[PDB]
């Protein structure tokens, strides 16, 4: 029979002492490197209590497979305690992210019909393509202004604005104008608050809420203010749309966006719809933008791969005779390159599931209700699970050797509670990259290795300044 839980290797049983050593040796912002180091110390499985929360950490795709196979109908991941506390104390209506069991399932099913299903997502293409085409126009404009036949700059802020325009366009069916020269300052304030919400989450992460206010008073206050901006503005957007819908009529044969559909025909109350709009808006700005920045970075770092991807896109646009829907079926190397970007640069350091039943992993008995985390960042850099892991190689995902990709594509999670925005995200990034590849060559002057920082979501440790050349 399997060894008991307590035999799983760990730094020890004192959550507070472990937390002390984590902060002193590695730091709150390098949690991803903490995992890498831990697997080097303990082997392919370990357990670690940080503060009051203990998790079993796993890296092997084979163990990942067992975990997700034993998943129940209503999976639970780790809830971020300052987010929970904010919603509870300020009585903020919660969406799919913070719900569980039947209440979660009910929202998820209604939302899948409108954001995941092919019948719905086929409508996103022109809405997303329009925003990407505008982004290209922004860069061409900056090139002309430069007078140099190129443009060099850190475009992270522009990527955030791009991600915002994209998510709002598919939700509201309306352009917010964030790619214009003169921007809406209140919409900019919304974008900034999302980042601030993530950033301020970090100093509170491994603490019960009773300790937040005692030791992180300023951070908690800043965090509360960030969420308040998120909610006040998402509320206004939704409420304005609700009333404008009644002012204009609800007789439309053309596609009007996700919100129109939900308000017009779903099992969701207005309360649930509005809560989920807020979460979709906030979940879609920092995610696709940082991911796309990493993709551009990997293309500049590997010019041969960039050439291959551009050639694939040009051939796809030609064969499809310009049709975007048809193109998206002829660009498998680009799609693989998105998987490759997420393997090296996951947004989420880990995936987590609480066990519903006892489960054996690595001949250790892991009891029901144990939090299990898959160290997705560590997995992506691990040379025993990926050949030459530091190398950006999209063809990796095209192997007929199904062993090479077995439970490796984890950047959007797995199963029924995988990323709700996955289809929006994939479509947005694929279309963005098609437009960029057709229009520009991407380089980085004085290229150097850019590391990663943990700001709740993973992000580049330092700015990346790109150089764009108009492609002929």
């Amino acid at each position: 029979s399997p060894r008991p839980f307590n035999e799983i290797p760990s730094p020890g049983d004192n959550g507070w002492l472990n937390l002390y050593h984590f902060w002193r040796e590695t730091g709150t912002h390098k949690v991803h490197l903490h995992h890498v180091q831990n697997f080097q110390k303990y082997g392919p499985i370990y357990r670690e209590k940080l503060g009051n929360v203990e998790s079993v950490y796993v890296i092997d795709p084979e163990d990942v497979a067992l975990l997700f196979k034993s998943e129940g109908p209503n999976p639970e991941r780790f809830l971020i305690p300052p987010w929970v506390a904010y919603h509870q104390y300020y009585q903020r209506p919660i969406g799919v992210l913070l719900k569980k069991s039947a209440a979660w399932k009910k929202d998820r099913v209604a939302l899948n019909q409108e954001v995941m299903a092919p019948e719905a997502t086929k409508n996103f293409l022109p809405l997303l393509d329009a925003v990407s085409r505008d982004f290209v126009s922004v860069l061409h404009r900056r090139i002309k202004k430069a007078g140099s036949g190129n443009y060099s700059g850190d475009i992270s802020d522009d990527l955030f604005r791009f991600a915002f325009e994209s998510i709002t366009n598919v939700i509201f069916g309306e352009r917010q104008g964030m790619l214009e020269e003169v921007v809406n300052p209140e919409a900019q304030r919304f974008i900034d608050a999302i980042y601030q919400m993530f950033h301020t989450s970090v100093p509170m992460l491994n603490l019960p809420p009773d300790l937040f206010r005692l030791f992180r008073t300023k951070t908690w206050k800043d965090h509360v203010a960030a969420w308040d901006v998120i909610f006040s503005k998402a509320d206004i957007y939704t409420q304005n749309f609700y009333w404008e819908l009644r002012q204009k009529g609800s007789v439309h044969h053309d596609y009007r966006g996700i919100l129109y559909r939900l308000l017009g025909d779903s099992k969701m109350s207005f309360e649930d719809i509005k809560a989920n709009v807020t979460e979709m808006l906030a979940g879609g700005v920092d995610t696709t933008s940082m991911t796309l920045q990493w993709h551009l970075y990997e293309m500049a770092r590997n010019l041969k791969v960039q050439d291959m991807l551009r050639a694939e896109v040009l051939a796809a646009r030609h064969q499809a005779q310009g049709d975007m829907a048809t193109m998206l079926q002829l660009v498998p190397l680009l799609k693989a390159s998105i998987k490759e970007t997420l393997r090296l640069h996951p947004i989420s350091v880990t995936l987590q599931r609480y066990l519903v039943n006892d489960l054996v992993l690595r001949d250790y008995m892991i009891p029901a209700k144990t939090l299990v985390q898959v160290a997705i960042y560590a997995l992506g850099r691990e040379p025993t699970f990926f050949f030459d892991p530091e190398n950006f190689d999209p063809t990796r995902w095209l192997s007929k050797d199904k062993n090479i990709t077995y439970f490796r594509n984890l950047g959007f999670g797995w199963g029924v509670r995988q990323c709700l925005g996955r289809r929006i995200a994939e479509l947005e990034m694929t279309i963005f990259l098609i437009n960029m590849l057709e229009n520009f060559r991407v380089e980085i002057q004085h290229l150097s290795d850019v590391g990663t920082t943990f700001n709740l979501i993973l992000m580049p440790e330092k700015p990346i300044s790109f150089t764009f050349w108009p492609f002929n």
Binding site: Q113, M116, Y406, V416, R423
Partner: peptide, 26 residues
């Protein structure tokens, strides 16, 4: 049919990726 016919699980290019991490509804 856990996700209920939306291509958001695998209990029953995009289907190709669900197929790896193992349909009915598609």
């Amino acid at each position: 049919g856990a996700c209920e016919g939306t291509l958001a699980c695998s209990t029953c290019d995009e289907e190709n990726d669900m197929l790896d991490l193992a349909l009915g509804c598609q």
